[model samples]
Target: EIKETFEVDDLDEALRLSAEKIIEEMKKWGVTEFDLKFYGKDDELAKKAKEVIEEAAKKAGVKVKSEFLYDENKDKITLELTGPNGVKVTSEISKDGIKSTVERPDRKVTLTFKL
Candidate 1:
């Protein structure tokens, strides 16, 4: 499992770019399936992130399942990603910033990809 954090100016653009990068990495690593996540500050960005993921999935010729959660009080959003094999990744964004988590039962990795 791994956790990562990134900061971007635009949530939508960030989501799209991240999805592309993830897909490319998966291909390079010979991973047939994987999960990805994007988090934003509100429902609007969350919806945009979802759209970005869907578009990326279609472009990458892969299937992705996504879930979004928004915390109004915190002004944050959380996205959970899971692949066909049940591998999981999580992304979260809030007033403080953006962060991500990746988990595979026994192993956990956390990183700050962007600041």
Candidate 2:
């Protein structure tokens, strides 16, 4: 599976560095690699990913899992994901305007001030 990730300046990087710390632990088992699938913004992507991972796990005769992340500071929206053969992917969006929307999967709101 392809990994997907986005960063808000350095927030995404932060997670990356932390992930490194767990590599040795993961290697304890044969956690080498296996079939994986990834995707982007679509109403069915979540379900699709779920199905893909399930099928892949059964096909590979091993365990499979994934992670999704969203982080923000003053003006950045970052989306990150990981899976499949230790793949890591990233994407980024710049933040502008007094009003903004910060989406962390399954959530939404284009916040604005009434002033």
Candidate 3:
């Protein structure tokens, strides 16, 4: 697997960009579904973040069939994209840290970040 690390300030913009990036990657790999989530204390913020990614998906012309969810646990957000062939890519974001993992039949890549 390959790995990298970094930091971020504008999380909203980051979320939007991440959505676009992940969606693009999903398409590149023929992924058919994606799950976007925010697990934290604030429901409104989570909902807002979901909306940002949803908007990004819409702009990319991808029909997202998965629905939003509500969870009361870790203060983090995650995006998981998957296909029927067992390929999966997960991107996680938090106030203090962020990480991503990509899994395919051929290889894997991991990226970590600070926030």
Candidate 4:
């Protein structure tokens, strides 16, 4: 419920940009302040991916806490952000596309590579 995966072959600039896009859209849903949780294949991988995402959040002026979870079998980074007032978003960044979901009271929408 708190994590979504990115299916990229490697975590690169494209994935970084995707994180930026995620932050951009989530802020519109009232997520100017949030907590970030990234799940990675290991501790080192998790921290790196967390930094990539945290960088994007700060660039957009969103208040964030950098954090990570380890998932040994995970082949890609999973991103989850939770915001005030029950607003949340999950994203699965992939080589060919992205899957994202937004949720809040009385409103829930799912989209692919689009805001």
Candidate 5:
């Protein structure tokens, strides 16, 4: 079983920092690398969030596979990344105007907010 913490932030910078924290936690938990899937509204915020996550993953020595945009009406974005230990980490980002949930092989993480 995998154990980790979820952080919430309204600012893009804060979110990026939070992503870094998540990566650090993964490493501390002996997770060499992992995948991430994000969901957000169909707006620039989502795009920016994806970019921030990708950058953080790269810095953390994680391999990113595919980052895709999901249903716009659903206002969500998804990303898949692979870790060195073959562990996959998935995440979702959603705000007031957006709602999203991320699921992995053994876990599911959900976030929702009304911005």
Candidate 6:
């Protein structure tokens, strides 16, 4: 039998949606409040990241567990975008707005972006 899958095109919408969907599943699955990670290189990332992750987790066909190594999550939402040559971005979103950061080997580059 052939397996079926669907593609995700609108990423921001997908992230917004998956964040909600994952929460629903988490509750149903009795997920503990820990740092669940979403991984990607900022530029190349989009809906595919979660697509691959959720699928891989389900396909592996095993129960998952963890220890109390991280605090409960601290953000309503997050999105990462790489900065100029060798820089990294981390962010948190809320009613206030987006709070972001930058890091690099050389600290002279402008880390701000025009929104």
User: Could you say which candidate leads in TM-score?
Assistant: 3
Model 1 residue 35 lDDT? 57
Error of 1 at 13 (Å): 3.3
What pairs collide in candidate 6?
A: none
Please identify model 1 stretches exceeding 4 Å from their true place: 1-7, 24-42, 66-74, 95-97, 104-115
Tens digit per residue, CA lDDT, model 1, 1-115: 5455566666454565566655654444445655555444456766666777678768878776554444456566676666554455566645444455545556564534343
Predicted candidate 3 versus true structure: per-residue lDDT over 1-115, tens digit per residue:
6776556666665566566666776677776555544345557657666677678778777666554455667567666655557767687777665577877777776766556
Candidate 4 per-residue lDDT, tens place, 26-108, comes to 77776778887777676664555567777887888888875767777776666788888888778675445556676777777
lDDT of 5 by residue, 1-115 (tens): 4333434445564456556755665565566545554444567876777677678878888655544545567754444445654445454444522223333445454433323
- Compute the lDDT for candidate 4: 0.67
TM-score of 3: 0.72
Sliding window of 10 residues with minimal summed lDDT for model 4? 1-10
How far residue 50's Cα lies from its native spot in candidate 6, in Å, is 12
Error of 6 at 26 (Å): 0.6
The digit string of per-residue lDDT tens for model 6 on 1-115 reads 1221223445444444433433333333444342334332333342444453345435434222221122234334454433234434343434343333433454322222212
lDDT of 2 at 100: 27
**C-alpha lDDT of all candidate models, in order:** 0.57, 0.34, 0.65, 0.67, 0.53, 0.36
For all candidates, the clash counts are 11, 10, 0, 1, 15, 0
Candidate with better lDDT, 5 vs 6: 5
lDDT of 2 by residue, 1-115 (tens): 2222323334223333323322322333345542233333433433433454355445445454554432222243233334344443232322221222323333332332121
C-alpha positional error of residue 70 in candidate 2 after TM-score superposition, expressed in Å: 6.7
Clashes of 1: 11
Any runs in candidate 6 off by more than 4 Å, and if so which? 1-9, 42-115
Best by lDDT: 4
